[PDB]
């Protein structure tokens, strides 16, 4: 089990994707999954350790490029919408 | 007299806004419409189609 890192988790064939964190939600014994409004799995019970983990997806957002005219200049600035600056992708991750 | 009337009218606006909860009906209605549209859009992911 890997927590606090975005992983391609496969809980009993759920084959989801997201970052796993410890959850304080108390699952009833007969239920092993937790959905939400969009009917996407939110919390799962570990089949081995029998602990409840929250599935929140990886940090995602839009990319806005602040540029003057190409005839004016060439430098650009990049805006990562609703993303904290502490987030640092060392490897290639989607845009750029 | 006119200054007192103006001050009393402003105070009455203060009181009416503070007491009546449905005073800001239009803005709350706009917010509710947008939130309901977003909630319906989210809930549409649960249908099989």
């Amino acid at each position: 089990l890997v927590k606090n890192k975005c992983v391609n988790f496969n809980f009993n064939g759920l084959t989801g994707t997201g970052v796993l964190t410890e959850s304080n939600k108390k699952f009833l014994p007969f239920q092993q999954f937790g959905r939400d409004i969009a009917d996407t799995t939110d919390a799962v019970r570990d089949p081995q350790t029998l602990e409840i983990l929250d599935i929140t997806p990886c940090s995602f957002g839009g990319v806005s490029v602040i540029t003057p005219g190409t005839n004016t200049s060439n430098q650009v600035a990049v805006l990562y919408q609703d993303v904290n600056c502490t987030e640092v992708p060392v490897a290639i991750h989607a845009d750029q | 007299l006119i200054a007192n009337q103006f001050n009393s009218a402003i105070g009455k606006i203060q009181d009416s806004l503070s007491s009546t909860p449905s005073a800001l009906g239009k803005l709350q209605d706009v917010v509710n419409q947008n939130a309901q549209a977003l909630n319906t859009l989210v809930k549409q992911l649960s249908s099989n189609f």
């Binding site: 969009a38 996407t40 929140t56 997806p57 995602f60 957002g61 839009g62 919408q81 609703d82 | 800001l24 803005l27 709350q28 917010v31 977003l38 859009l41 989210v42 992911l45």
Partner: peptide, 25 residues
């Protein structure tokens, strides 16, 4: 008049004019 944790591609862009700037106007 009365942040949502919507992760299905939905985001709320902040207004350009903050409430402080609107109050300053």
């Amino acid at each position: 008049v009365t942040c949502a944790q919507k992760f299905n591609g939905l985001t709320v862009l902040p207004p350009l004019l903050t409430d402080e700037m609107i109050a300053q106007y």
